[PDB]
Task: inverse folding
C-alpha cells in the first residue's frame, strides 16, 4: 500500500493550478524567488537559473529518461560566482526567508565540442532527445566531465549489452539501468550501482486529461494481483492448519468421552462395592459337608 | 547490539544489504578477506565529522562492500549476487602519506587534514583513503573562508590544478578546470547537511526505538500481571483439589 499511497490522489490534487518547480523543490522559494532573482542576477555576472525549467520532460517519456534525470539532478543547480566575499553575501541573501535546501553553485563556463560523433546511431532514440533543453552548451559543460550520450541505455536483459565486459575501445561507457522502479546501472566486470529518481508534476503533464492514475494503473493492478495470490496461499495454509485444529479438537472430544465413560465405570465400581453378599450359607454348608 | 542496526533499518535496500551480511555471517564459509560496510566500522567523533565523511564519499558508494585487493573481486559475493540487491567498491592503490609532516613552509598551526580523525577497519580505512583521498582533504576547525580558497586558486607550485575536493563546515568546494573553456578554474560550492551515517553515535539517540522499548516494558508488566492472575487461578485449582480429596 505504501508503495503507491504517496501518490494516490496528490498528483490529481493540484487544485487545477500550475504547480511550479520553484516550490516543488521545497515549499518556501516560490514566495521569495520572484523578488530574489534580480538580487541573484545583480552581483557578479547575472545568475543562471536553477536549471529546473531549462531541462524538463518532453512528450511525457520518462521511463528511459529517469536514468539521466537522476544523473543531472545529482548536480542541477548552477549559480555563477567569482568573488568569495560576493559568494558569502550571496549565501546570506539566499538565507532570506529560509531555504532548507542544498543548492549547488556552478560557475563552469560554456564548452564548445561536438557530441554526436561519439555515439553509435540506432533506431532506438537517444535518451537525451527525450529531455527538453534550451541551449546545448548548458548541458555540454557538464557532459565533458561525465559523458551521458555515449552510454548504451537498455533494460536488464536484452541485446547490445556486456560492452563493459567486452571493454571499451574508441568508446567509453555503456552503463544503463535495469528496472524502471529502481535500475542498477549496468557494469560489465564491475558491481552495478542503483539510482533513485523523484516524481513530481512540474509541467502540464496533465494537459490532455487529469484522470486518476492513468500511468499508475499497471503498477497498482499488478500489486493487487500479488496481494491476491499471497492472501490466497495464506488462506490455504490457515485453512489446512485450522482443519488440523478441528481434527485435534475432535480427538479431544473423543478423549473426553472416554474419560467420562471411565467415570461411569467407577460409579458402577462403587455401586458393586456396596452390594449384599450371600456366601454365608455357602460357607456354613461347606463346613457342614466337611 | 552496539553494532549499527536501527540506522540500517531506514532503507529497504539497505535492509536487503543487512540480510546479505546476515547470511554471510551465519555461514562461516571460507573468509579469505572478510567484507563489511564502511558505514558500520567508521566512527565519527561528532555528527559534523559524520557529515564530512558522508559527503567525502558518495551515498551509494557508502552503501557498498569494500574490496581491498582487486585480485579477488567476485570470489566473495558469488551466491548472494541474485538473492538480494547489494553494492561493492573497488580499490587499486592510493597514498596514505599525510601532508604537513613537519614545519614545512607554514607556521599557522590550523588543525590538519581529513586523515586525522578517522578510525576503523583496515579494509574500510583503505577504501575511504582510495575513494575520498583523506590525505589531500584539509579541514580547519577555525577561521576558514573561501577567500583563502581564492588566494590558493592560483596554481600552487605543487600542481597547476589546486585540489580535487575540500570540505569545511556546511560547505563543499570542488576544484575543476575548463577542458574546452579558458583553462581557468571554476570552483563549485555545494551546501551540505548533517548526516547520521559514519557517525560514532549508536543509531539516533534523539528518538531511537525508546518509545517502542517503553511500550514493550508496559506489555511486559501486563504479562506479569496476567501471570499473577494465572497463579491465583492455580491456587484456586489447588483449593478445588483439596475439596476433591475432602470429598474422597
Result:
Amino acid at each position: 500500500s505504501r508503495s503507491i499511497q504517496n501518490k494516490k490522489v496528490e498528483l490529481q490534487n493540484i487544485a487545477k493550478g500550475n504547480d511550479t518547480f520553484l516550490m516543488n523543490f521545497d515549499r518556501n522559494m516560490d514566495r521569495l524567488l520572484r523578488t530574489i532573482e534580480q538580487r541573484k542576477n545583480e552581483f557578479e555576472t547575472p545568475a543562471i537559473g536553477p536549471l529546473g525549467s531549462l531541462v524538463t520532460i518532453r512528450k511525457g517519456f520518462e521511463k528511459w529518461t529517469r536514468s539521466i534525470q537522476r544523473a543531472i539532478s545529482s548536480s542541477l543547480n548552477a549559480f555563477v560566482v567569482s568573488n568569495p566575499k560576493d559568494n558569502r553575501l550571496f549565501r546570506d541573501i539566499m538565507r532570506s526567508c529560509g531555504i532548507r535546501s542544498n543548492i549547488p553553485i556552478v560557475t563552469y563556463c560554456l564548452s564548445q565540442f561536438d557530441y554526436s560523433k561519439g555515439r553509435a546511431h540506432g533506431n532506438y532514440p537517444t535518451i537525451v532527445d527525450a529531455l527538453e533543453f534550451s541551449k546545448p552548451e548548458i548541458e555540454c559543460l557538464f557532459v565533458d566531465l561525465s559523458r551521458i550520450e555515449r552510454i548504451v541505455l537498455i533494460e536488464d536483459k536484452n541485446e547490445a549489452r556486456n560492452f563493459l565486459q567486452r571493454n571499451p575501445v574508441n568508446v567509453n561507457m555503456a552503463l544503463s539501468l535495469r528496472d524502471r522502479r529502481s535500475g542498477f546501472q549496468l557494469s560489465g566486470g564491475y558491481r552495478l550501482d542503483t539510482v533513485t529518481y523523484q516524481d513530481k508534476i512540474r509541467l502540464k503533464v496533465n494537459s490532455s486529461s487529469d484522470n486518476g492514475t492513468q500511468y499508475l494503473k499497471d503498477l497498482i493492478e499488478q500489486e493487487t494481483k500479488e496481494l491476491q495470490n499471497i492472501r490466497d496461499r495464506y488462506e490455504e495454509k490457515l485453512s489446512e492448519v485450522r482443519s488440523r485444529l478441528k481434527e485435534i479438537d475432535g480427538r479431544l472430544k473423543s478423549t473426553k468421552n472416554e474419560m467420562r465413560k471411565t467415570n461411569f465405570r467407577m460409579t458402577e465400581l462403587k455401586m458393586n462395592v456396596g452390594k449384599v453378599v450371600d456366601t454365608g450359607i455357602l460357607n456354613s454348608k461347606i463346613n457342614e459337608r466337611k | 547490539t552496539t553494532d549499527k542496526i536501527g540506522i540500517l533499518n531506514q532503507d529497504q535496500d539497505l535492509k536487503e544489504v543487512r540480510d546479505a551480511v546476515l547470511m554471510v555471517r551465519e555461514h562461516p564459509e571460507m573468509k579469505d578477506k572478510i567484507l563489511e560496510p564502511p558505514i558500520m566500522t567508521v566512527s565519527a567523533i561528532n555528527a559534523q565529522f559524520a557529515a564530512y565523511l558522508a559527503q567525502c564519499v558518495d551515498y551509494n558508494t557508502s552503501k557498498a562492500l569494500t574490496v581491498v585487493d582487486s585480485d579477488s573481486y567476485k570470489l566473495f559475493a558469488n551466491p548472494i549476487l541474485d538473492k538480494f540487491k547489494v553494492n561493492l567498491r573497488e580499490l587499486s592503490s592510493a597514498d596514505t602519506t599525510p601532508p604537513v609532516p613537519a614545519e614545512t613552509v607554514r607556521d599557522l598551526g590550523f588543525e590538519g587534514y581529513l586523515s586525522d580523525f578517522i578510525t576503523g577497519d583496515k579494509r574500510v580505512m583503505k577504501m575511504l583513503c582510495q575513494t575520498s583521498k583523506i590525505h589531500t582533504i584539509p579541514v580547519s576547525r577555525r577561521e576558514l573562508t573561501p577567500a583563502q580558497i581564492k588566494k590558493l586558486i592560483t596554481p600552487r607550485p605543487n600542481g597547476k590544478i589546486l585540489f580535487k575536493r575540500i570540505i569545511h563546515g556546511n560547505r563543499l568546494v570542488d576544484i575543476k578546470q575548463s577542458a574546452y573553456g579558458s583553462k581557468q578554474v571554476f570552483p563549485t560550492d555545494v551546501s551540505i547537511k548533517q548526516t547520521n551515517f559514519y557517525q560514532g553515535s549508536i543509531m539516533s539517540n534523539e528518538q531511537k526505538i525508546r518509545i517502542e522499548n517503553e511500550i514493550i516494558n508496559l506489555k511486559n508488566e501486563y504479562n506479569d500481571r496476567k501471570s499473577t492472575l494465572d497463579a491465583l487461578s492455580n491456587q484456586k485449582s489447588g483449593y478445588r483439589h483439596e475439596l476433591s480429596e475432602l470429598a474422597s
Residues 217-273 of chain A form the longest helix (57 residues). The radius of gyration of chain A is 39 Å. Strands of chain A lie at 56-57, 131-132.
